[PDB]
Chain A
Amino acid sequence: MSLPAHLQQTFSPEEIQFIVENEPIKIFPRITTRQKIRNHTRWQLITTDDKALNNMVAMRSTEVVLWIALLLKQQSKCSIVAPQWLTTKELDRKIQYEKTHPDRFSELPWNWLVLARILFNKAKDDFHDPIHELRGKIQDLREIRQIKVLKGLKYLNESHLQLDNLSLLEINELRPFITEIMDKLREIHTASLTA
C-alpha cells in the first residue's frame, strides 16, 4: 500500500533524526549577516524563525534550528555549541544517578541519543571535553538504561505501563515489542472476560 510495512506503526530512526533536527541549538557563527547602518538576500523561512539568522554576528552565540546549524557546519561557517548535559561532569552525574536509583531512569533529555550521535558525527571538534571520553560515557549510560529496560519489560501487564524519563530513540526501538506483547495480553484478558 501507500505506506510500507516497516513504517506501519513506528518511526524509522531516520524519521527520529528528522524530528530531532527541528529542535533549536546554540551556535557560534563564523559569518555576519547583520546589515550595518551604512544587496543581500534574507532567509525568510516558513517553518522556523529567521530573526536569529539575519542577525548573526561572528563569535556571538545565537540559537538556530538544528538542521540549519548542521547545514552551516557543513562549511566552516558556524560552530555548534554542545548542550550543557553533554559534558563529562554532567554525564558522570547522570551515571551516578542511574547507579544510585535502580528503579527509575535518569532525567536525560528526550533526544540525548540522537543529539549525541549527530554532534559526534558532524561537530566532532566543538567539544570542550575529549570526544573519546564523551563516547565512552554515552555508551555507559546506554548500557545502564538498557539493563533497567530489560528488567521492566518483565512488568508487561495488560492495563498500562509508566516508562518515565525514557528517551525517544529507546521508546522507538522498544515500541514494536511492548505494544505488540501488551496487545496479546489484552486480547487474552478480554477473551476471558466475555461474560
Chain B
Amino acid sequence: TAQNYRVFSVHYSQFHGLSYSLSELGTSSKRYYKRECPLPMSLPNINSDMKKDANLDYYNFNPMGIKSLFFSSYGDPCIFGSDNTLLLLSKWRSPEESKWLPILDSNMEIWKMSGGKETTDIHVWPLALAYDTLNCILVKGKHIWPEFPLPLPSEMEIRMPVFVKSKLLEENKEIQIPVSMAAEEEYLRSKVLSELLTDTLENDGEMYGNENEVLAALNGAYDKALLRLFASACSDQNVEKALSLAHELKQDRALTAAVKISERAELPSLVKKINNIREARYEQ
C-alpha cells in the first residue's frame, strides 16, 4: 500500500516471520524509514484450526487474513486483520522511535455499541482512517465480505483498548462507561493525537489550514482530562497522586483551575503544592 510519495509493505516468510518495511521513494531522494523490522500483528493460527463458520473461504482467499494496510491522512501506516485492532506508527519518522500503538478495538467498540451482546454477525471492512475517522463497511450477516451494492462507509471513532470488562460490567444486562476510566481514555487519545499532529506540523507543514486550531482544542481537552483526573485523585484524599498528575498540565489556566480544585476538594495541603507548581511555571 502506497501513499503519495511513500511505500509501505509487509514481508512474510516461514523463517523470518512478519516483517514490515516503510520506504519513502520521494521525488528525488529515496529516504528510507524502516527495513524488515518485526511487527506486532497477530497472524490467525488458533482460529485457522478447522474451527470456523464461513471464514474458511475468506481465509483461503487471504491466507494471512490481513484485511488492509491503509495509510492515514497524515501518512501514518495502519494495519487491520483478524484481531480487529488498528495498528498505528506514532513516531514513525525516527527508526529508533518506532511505536506500534493499537488505536482502535473493533470487537470492544462493537460490543459497547450493540447493547451488551457479544455479537459476531457484525464484521468490519476498513477502508481508510483520517484523524479519528475510520471509514469501514459494517456488513451484517454470515458473509464477511460485502456484496456488489457496496454499503455506505459508516464511520467509527478510534478508542484505546483501555476499556476493562470488569469495570464495564458494572451494569450487567447505550452501554454505560465508567467515568473514572472514560476521562483517562480521552486523555490517552488526546495525547496520542497531539503527538501525531506535532510530527506533521513542523515536518509536513500545514495541510488544511486548521491543524493549529484543532491541535489547540485537542490540547484544551487534554488538560481538561488532566483536571478531571486531578479531581478524581483528590476525591480519594491522595495528595501525592494529584501532585504527580499536576506536573503534566500544559495550559497555566488549567493549573489555576487545579488550584481551585485543590482549595475546594477538602485538600488544603494540595493548595500550597499546586501554587508552587504554578510559581515555578511563572519562570518556565
- A residues contacting B by CB (< 8 A) are 28, 34-37, 57, 59-61, 79, 81, 125-126, 128
Give the size of the chain B interface in residues (CB under 8 angstroms).
18
**What would 10 more interface pairs be, CB under 8 Å, given A37-B208, A128-B151, A128-B152?**
A28-B152, A35-B209, A36-B208, A37-B205, A37-B207, A59-B127, A59-B128, A61-B155, A81-B152, A128-B140
Using CB atoms, name the residue of chain A closest to B149.
A125
Bound CA–CA A20/B208 (angstroms): 33
Q: Does any Cβ of A come within 8 Å of B130's Cβ?
A: yes
Please name 11 pairs of A and B residues whose Cβ atoms are closer than 8 Å in the assembled complex, sorted by A: A28-B152, A34-B208, A37-B209, A59-B127, A59-B135, A61-B133, A79-B152, A81-B152, A126-B152, A128-B140, A128-B152
Q: Measured between alpha carbons, how far is A34 from B130 in the docked complex, in Å?
A: 15
Across-interface contacts of A35 in B (CB, < 8 A): 209
Q: Which residue in chain B gives the minimum CB-CB distance to A79?
A: B152
A61 to B153, CA, bound (A): 10
Q: Mark interface residues in B132-174 (1 if CB within 8 Å of A CB, else 0).
A: 0101001010000000010111110000000000000000000
Residues of A within 8 A of B130 (CB): 57, 60
* Cα distance, A59 to B137, chains bound together (Å): 12
Which of B154, B206, B208 interacts with A128 by CB under 8 Å?
B154
Task: Name the B residues within 8 Å of A125 (CB-CB).
Answer: 149
Q: Could you tell me if B155 and A37 are in contact, using CB atoms closer than 8 angstroms?
A: no
Nearest Cβ on chain B to A88's Cβ, whole angstroms: 10
Residues of A within 8 A of B205 (CB): 37
6 A-B pairs with least C-beta separation: A37-B206, A59-B135, A61-B155, A59-B153, A128-B151, A126-B152
Q: How many A-B residue pairs have CB under 8 A?
A: 28
Residue of A57, A59, A81 with most partner-chain B CB within 10 A: A59
- B194-213 contacts to A, CB under 8 A, are 205-209
The answer to whether A60 and B209 touch (CB under 8 A), given A81-B152, A128-B151, A128-B154, is no
Residue of B nearest to A127 (CB): B152
Q: Which residue of B lies closest to A80 (CB)?
A: B152
Residues of A close to B151: CB separation below 8 A? 128
Instruction: With both chains docked as a complex, state the minimum distance between the C-beta of A62 and any C-beta of chain B, in angstroms.
Output: 11
Give the docked Cα–Cα distance between A57 and B207 (Å).
13
Bound-complex Cα distance A61 to B157 (A): 12
A58 to chain B, nearest CB (A): 10
A156 CA to B127 CA in the complex, in Å? Answer: 57
* Residues from chain B with Cβ under 8 Å of A57 in the complex: 130
B131 nearest in chain A by CB position: A60
Chain A residues whose CB sits within 8 angstroms of the CB of B135 once the complex forms: 59
Q: Which residues of A contact B149 (CB under 8 A)?
A: 125
Contact partners of B207 in chain A: CB under 8 A = 37
By beta carbon, the residue of chain A nearest B115 is: A89
A79→B150 CA distance, assembly (Å): 13
Q: Taking the nearest CB of chain A, how far is it from the CB of B202, in angstroms?
A: 15
Q: How far is the CB of A69 from chain B (nearest CB, A)?
A: 14
Alpha-carbon separation in the docked complex, A89 to B217 (Å)? 36
In the bound complex, CA of A36 to CA of B209 (Å): 8
Residues on B with C-beta less than 8 A from A37 are: 205-209
Residues of chain B within 8 A of A79, CB atoms compared: 152
- Cβ–Cβ < 8 Å partners of B138 in chain A: 128
Chain A: CB-nearest residue to B209: A37
